Design a protein around this ligand. Structure first.
Ligand code: HEC
Ligand code: HEC
Ligand SMILES: [Ca+2]
Ligand SMILES: [Ca+2]
Ligand SMILES: [Cl-]
Ligand SMILES: [Mg+2]
Lengths: 251, 352
């Protein structure tokens, strides 16, 4: 509470179908209800009468403030890569008995994010850069070495490649390989899962009929979903606030 | 001297071509109206002599050691051999019609001469030891303008500029074999003035124009009649042929002619004869565009009149009629030969 946040509804592969773009905040001990996902219950429409299963998971105990579960750190998937469930992290916790559920995700120090330099780039170096060089776009090689563009060196070759715009496409939607805050709309993810994930096609020619190579088995589930999370988060580069030890802009 | 195709005399040299010694100390200018070749010292930028050759030289090539200069005399239908140190022509070898260009093999043992006569298809080979014309390699069509030899020296490309043809092509020759392996057509092209190789030998650049012949002649806007283009061809088997624009919407490069390739393949230099300027392009952005685009997308991008600004480094003011350009071996200087102004423009490149 007392921190800015928003939400994303997810499908059975763990990808965001719709993102709520705004900043929501809860006061301490407060709780907030909404009929739907931008349904208009908080804008122009009356609350729809709905008998929900979640209502009984909220507060059922008189010795507690709230009996609702805290946000889980990780996910569990099956062998198919489909959603199995939710998974507890290391941050679990005076404390008193004022809630039934385990206390998770209240430590700001330990809150997890996906950083391109720390997380994604090593995966790219290990499983990708071998077959992707200047002669085979996108160019994922070069490691974390910064690339100067118009007199400014910020990011690496792989980041510059993956975030590249596409002709005839609104960059607010996405680029060639990446759609920020939609992984399901991203060509990169389309190829990593080797399937058509959404009803919005990134381009006209997606899967080559000649010389095609299946990319779905190159990564484990953790790596691939790390990329998914990275894209859904807005596909940043430096996700650690303030100057850090990881490669970046310096003068 | 005489103005080309005329009996009218002029005192002006009229430089048609330029090249440089592999050690970069000397420039050799072929004077079309002067019937001679001007020697210039690179460091002092001073004329160190003028060597008389046969009628109307349009081209010259230097031996790897730099002891000899092979000049193409177009009207004389011949090739002069010049001693560089003696500043004297020691022989005249006779070739097919209008040699428009000549180049020496990497080993320096062979010279290749493109015979550009409109009804002539030939590339004449010349042994440097015999100083004589061995045989002729017949191209796929008429009018080879210029040749170029690959860095590995096992392949020879020839631009065929063929009169009365909308589709003008490029021939690939196997030097050891001495025959045509493949012919690649540049669709809707005319006036191919040059061909160059990339240092890695994976691409060739060809300057030309795109006419719209099947359309009424009505306006000058949006390149309704002529557009000016540079084409990058991938030397691999089944490689892409990418026709790319040289023009802005309201600014066009008239009649692109001469080309100079950066030694490391960083930049491309294009003499623009009609617009009297040197167009410098970024070759990694160009080749980057070629690698990342399909054939369809490139074919659509040929008519994009805003596309140049992506890969365009500069357009540099020159004298009148810069028909030819050349580079120093370090690539820090570009020289452009100006016919009407009778001079050479010296340009400091982006390389540092
Ligand atoms: C060699 C075995 C490769 C490895 C390792 C990786 N990729 Fe690849 N990729 C390879 C080829 C031969 C091709 C050609 C086109 C095709 O679909 O087969 C590709 C293509 C891609 C693409 C599509 C590019 C486009 O259509 O514009 C993407 C997005 C891509 N590759 C990404 C990618 C990633 C993320 C990799 C690490 C898991 C990776 N590639 C490895 C060959 C090889
Ligand atoms: C699906 C994702 C959800 C859910 C679960 C909630 N909201 Fe709402 N929300 C959503 C969208 C797509 C948008 C607009 C995004 C955009 O315009 O780019 C919003 C917006 C808001 C706002 C801003 C004002 C407005 O647009 O009306 C507020 C405030 C807001 N949402 C509040 C809110 C509340 C109280 C919810 C109940 C838990 C809630 N959101 C859930 C989509 C989604
Ligand atoms: Ca930081
Ligand atoms: Ca003749
Ligand atoms: Cl709602
Ligand atoms: Mg008009």
């Amino acid at each position: 509470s007392d921190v800015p946040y928003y939400m994303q509804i997810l499908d059975d592969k763990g990808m965001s179908v719709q993102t709520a773009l705004t900043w929501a905040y809860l006061r301490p001990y407060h709780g907030r209800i909404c009929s739907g996902c931008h349904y208009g219950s908080y804008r122009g429409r009356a609350f729809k009468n709905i008998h929900a299963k979640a209502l009984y998971n909220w507060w059922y105990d008189d010795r507690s403030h709230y009996d609702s579960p805290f946000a889980f750190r990780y996910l569990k998937f099956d062998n198919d890569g489909n959603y199995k469930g939710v998974k507890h992290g290391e941050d679990v916790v005076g404390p008193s008995g004022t809630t039934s559920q385990p206390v998770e995700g209240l430590t700001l120090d330990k809150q997890r994010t996906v950083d391109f330099r720390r997380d994604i780039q090593p995966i790219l170096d290990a499983k990708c850069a071998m077959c992707h060089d200047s002669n085979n776009p996108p160019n994922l090689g070069g490691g974390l070495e910064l690339v100067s563009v118009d007199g400014i060196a910020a990011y690496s070759r792989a980041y510059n490649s993956l975030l590249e715009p596409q002709r005839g496409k609104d960059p607010n939607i996405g680029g060639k390989y990446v759609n920020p805050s939609a992984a399901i709309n991203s060509l990169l993810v389309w190829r990593l899962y080797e399937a058509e994930l959404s009803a919005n096609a990134p381009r006209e020619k997606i899967f080559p009929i000649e010389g095609r190579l299946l990319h779905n088995k190159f990564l484990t589930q953790d790596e691939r979903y790390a990329i998914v999370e990275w894209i859904d988060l807005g596909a940043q580069w430096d996700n650690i606030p303030g100057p850090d030890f990881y490669p970046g802009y310096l003068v | 001297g005489y103005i080309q195709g005329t009996h009218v005399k002029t005192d002006l040299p009229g430089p048609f071509h330029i090249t440089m010694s592999p050690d970069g100390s000397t420039l050799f200018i072929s004077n079309q109206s002067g019937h001679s070749v001007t020697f210039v010292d690179a460091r002092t930028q001073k004329v160190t002599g003028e060597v008389a050759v046969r009628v109307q030289p349009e081209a010259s090539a230097v031996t790897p050691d730099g002891a000899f200069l092979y000049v193409c005399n177009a009207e004389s239908d011949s090739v002069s051999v010049v001693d560089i140190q003696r500043k004297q022509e020691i022989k005249e070898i006779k070739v097919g019609d209008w040699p428009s260009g000549i180049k020496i093999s990497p080993d320096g043992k062979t010279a290749y001469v493109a015979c550009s006569g409109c009804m002539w298809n030939a590339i004449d080979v010349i042994d440097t030891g015999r100083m004589e014309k061995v045989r002729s390699i017949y191209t796929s069509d008429y009018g080879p303008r210029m040749v170029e030899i690959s860095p590995d020296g096992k392949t020879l490309v020839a631009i065929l500029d063929t009169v009365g043809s909308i589709n003008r092509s490029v021939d690939f020759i196997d030097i050891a074999s001495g025959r045509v392996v493949e012919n690649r057509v540049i669709h809707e092209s005319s006036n191919l003035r040059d061909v160059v190789y990339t240092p890695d030998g994976k691409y060739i650049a060809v300057t030309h124009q795109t006419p719209k012949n099947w359309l009424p002649v009505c306006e000058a806007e949006n390149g309704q009649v002529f557009t000016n283009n540079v084409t990058i061809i991938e030397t691999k088997a089944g490689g892409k042929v990418a026709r790319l624009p040289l023009d802005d919407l309201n600014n066009y490069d008239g009649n692109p002619y001469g080309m100079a390739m950066d030694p490391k393949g960083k930049y491309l230099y294009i003499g623009v004869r009609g617009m009297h300027r040197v167009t410098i392009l970024d070759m990694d952005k160009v080749l980057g565009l070629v690698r990342s685009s399909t054939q369809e997308e490139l074919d659509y991008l040929r008519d994009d009149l805003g596309l140049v600004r992506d890969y365009l480094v500069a357009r540099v003011p020159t004298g009148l009629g810069p028909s030819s350009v050349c580079l120093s071996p370090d690539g820090k200087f570009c020289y452009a030969a100006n016919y009407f102004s009778n001079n050479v423009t010296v340009i400091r490149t982006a390389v540092d």
